[PDB]
């Protein structure tokens, strides 16, 4: 099933949860899913260890319990795999398969000097992520935080959708709004919970893959990649003026095919957006 770790094991294998970034000599890889993520090395295997931090306690155990329940049921090549967990004490940890190529956001940004992703590889990554989302939707889960920074990349650059648990079952309303603003559908930003909002957010990821630009850049005009989309519709701009210049293999025809899928995903009216299945068909027809 899952591996039951005890906290002392995870502490030993993460340099006692060394919170400096890995660049600096520590074990921290990021923060999210209600915790800090650290690199560990256990039994000849590199792992990612998420140590949950307290919203409040008591609801934390419920969320940890729920994330495990979701992962037990959600096994797929385009989803991050949970390996085990630690629950002894006031301390809660989740242990995942390690993804050596980091996030799609970081690779689109060539963080740390990694080479630019080719157009052909971007197309594969887009299809992989759509496959992961389709598995989630088929199994009545809503991700709620679809973004490039949550699409991880293994040894082969296979797309791995991460950070659910918070993955609700499947129009509900909520007082505690979650997600990442620059990626959120307008109805999600008002608190409607629906798988159609994951589609919208996936439209945004597609624009990041096309253009190489982050969804938000506060030193850019416009700060929001979403707006750049309205420029193309309303302002004599073309997607071609926006194609990532860090590629040498992006043909006009498939670029436009992906942009058209992005544009369908991005309808403001949730009911006009394609479903994940259609998005897969489209992304497949694209290659």
């Amino acid at each position: 099933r899952f591996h039951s770790f005890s906290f002392y094991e995870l502490k030993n294998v993460t340099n006692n949860f060394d919170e400096r970034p890995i660049s600096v000599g520590g074990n921290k890889m990021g923060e999210g899913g209600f915790g800090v993520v650290y690199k560990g090395y256990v039994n000849n295997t590199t792992v990612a260890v998420k140590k949950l931090a307290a919203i409040t306690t008591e609801e934390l155990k419920q969320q940890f319990d729920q994330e495990i329940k979701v992962m037990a049921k959600c096994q797929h090549e385009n989803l991050v795999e949970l390996l085990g967990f630690s629950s002894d004490g006031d301390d809660l940890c989740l242990v995942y398969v390690y993804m050596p190529n980091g996030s799609l956001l970081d690779r689109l940004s060539c963080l740390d000097g990694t080479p630019p992703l080719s157009w052909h590889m971007r197309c594969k990554i887009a299809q992989g992520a759509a496959n992961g989302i389709n598995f989630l939707h088929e199994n009545h889960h809503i991700h709620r935080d679809i973004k490039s920074a949550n699409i991880l990349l293994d040894e082969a650059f296979t797309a791995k959708i991460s950070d659910f648990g918070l993955a609700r079952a499947s129009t509900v309303m909520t007082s505690r709004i979650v997600g990442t603003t620059a990626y959120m559908a307008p109805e999600a930003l008002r608190g409607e919970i629906t798988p159609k909002s994951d589609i919208y957010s996936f439209g945004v990821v597609l624009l990041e893959i096309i253009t190489g630009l982050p969804a938000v850049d506060e030193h850019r005009e416009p700060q929001l990649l979403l707006d750049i989309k309205e420029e193309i519709e309303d302002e004599e701009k073309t997607i071609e003026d926006y194609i990532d210049k860090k590629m040498n293999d992006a043909d006009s025809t498939s670029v436009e095919a992906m942009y058209s899928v992005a544009s369908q995903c991005l309808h403001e009216k949730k009911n006009k957006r394609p479903d994940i299945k259609k998005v897969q068909q489209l992304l497949q027809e694209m290659t």
Side-chain angles (χ1 to χ4, degrees), residues 77-122:
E77 57 194 345
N78 298 115
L79 308 190
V80 183
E81 180 191 353
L82 189 73
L83 288 183
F85 52 73
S86 205
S87 55
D88 54 326
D90 219 20
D91 305 289
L92 303 154
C93 303
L94 295 170
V95 178
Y96 301 87
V97 168
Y98 178 59
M99 296 313 166
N101 292 308
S103 73
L104 179 53
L105 179 83
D106 296 340
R107 300 287 80 70
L108 289 165
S109 108
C110 308
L111 189 62
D112 295 329
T114 51
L117 299 170
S118 69
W119 182 243
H120 185 253
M121 192 53 40
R122 288 174 211 214

Side-chain angles (χ1 to χ4, degrees), residues 130 261 275-286:
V261 184
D275 66 10
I276 191 58
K277 189 48 75 182
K278 184 39 128 154
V279 175
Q280 273 179 311
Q281 299 167 211
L282 290 175
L283 286 171
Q284 192 45 62
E285 291 156 19
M286 176 189 70

Side-chain angles (χ1 to χ4, degrees), residues 47-265:
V47 304
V49 181
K50 197 225 260 152
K51 187 175 174 270
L52 288 189
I55 68 149
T56 58
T57 300
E58 190 66 75
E59 277 166 302
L60 252 200
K61 181 63 172 144
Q62 198 102 316
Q63 291 271 354
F64 162 94
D65 275 9
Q66 185 55 29
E67 179 175 10
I68 296 160
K69 215 175 189 288
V70 168
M71 306 305 263
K73 290 309 169 147
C74 285
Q75 294 205 116
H76 184 275
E77 57 194 345
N78 298 115
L79 308 190
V80 183
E81 180 191 353
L82 189 73
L83 288 183
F85 52 73
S86 205
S87 55
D88 54 326
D90 219 20
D91 305 289
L92 303 154
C93 303
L94 295 170
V95 178
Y96 301 87
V97 168
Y98 178 59
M99 296 313 166
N101 292 308
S103 73
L104 179 53
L105 179 83
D106 296 340
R107 300 287 80 70
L108 289 165
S109 108
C110 308
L111 189 62
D112 295 329
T114 51
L117 299 170
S118 69
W119 182 243
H120 185 253
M121 192 53 40
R122 288 174 211 214
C123 292
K124 290 202 226 168
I125 295 165
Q127 297 167 159
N131 263 91
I133 304 167
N134 180 57
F135 186 87
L136 294 177
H137 287 10
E138 277 183 341
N139 288 100
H140 298 90
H141 287 113
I142 306 170
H143 185 101
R144 301 223 283 158
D145 201 10
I146 293 295
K147 55 186 192 173
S148 279
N150 270 349
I151 294 176
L152 291 175
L153 297 157
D154 81 356
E155 262 292 300
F157 292 86
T158 289
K160 309 284 185 165
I161 284 146
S162 54
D163 199 356
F164 351 68
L166 51 136
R168 290 292 158 88
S170 80
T171 53
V172 190
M173 214 73 31
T174 249
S175 324
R176 199 251 262 152
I177 273 147
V178 339
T180 299
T181 309
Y183 302 85
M184 285 176 281
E187 81 284 353
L189 292 161
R190 297 176 212 281
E192 303 178 28
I193 301 182
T194 165
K196 291 146 146 74
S197 308
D198 285 341
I199 308 295
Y200 186 95
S201 292
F202 189 64
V204 188
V205 176
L206 298 178
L207 298 188
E208 301 176 305
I209 288 161
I210 300 185
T211 56
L213 299 161
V216 56
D217 180 344
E218 61 172 49
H219 298 311
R220 183 181 68 210
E221 274 302 318
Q223 309 201 192
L224 295 172
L225 194 54
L226 283 171
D227 296 342
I228 273 134
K229 172 217 191 196
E230 325 310 321
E231 287 176 326
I232 295 144
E233 304 187 70
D234 294 343
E235 178 182 330
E236 350 285 315
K237 222 85 196 69
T238 184
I239 63 151
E240 283 115 81
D241 305 320
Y242 284 100
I243 303 173
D244 197 341
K245 287 170 173 192
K246 308 186 279 330
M247 315 188 268
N248 81 169
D249 67 320
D251 60 295
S252 279
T253 308
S254 69
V255 172
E256 288 275 357
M258 191 188 285
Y259 175 74
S260 165
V261 184
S263 199
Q264 294 171 55
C265 286

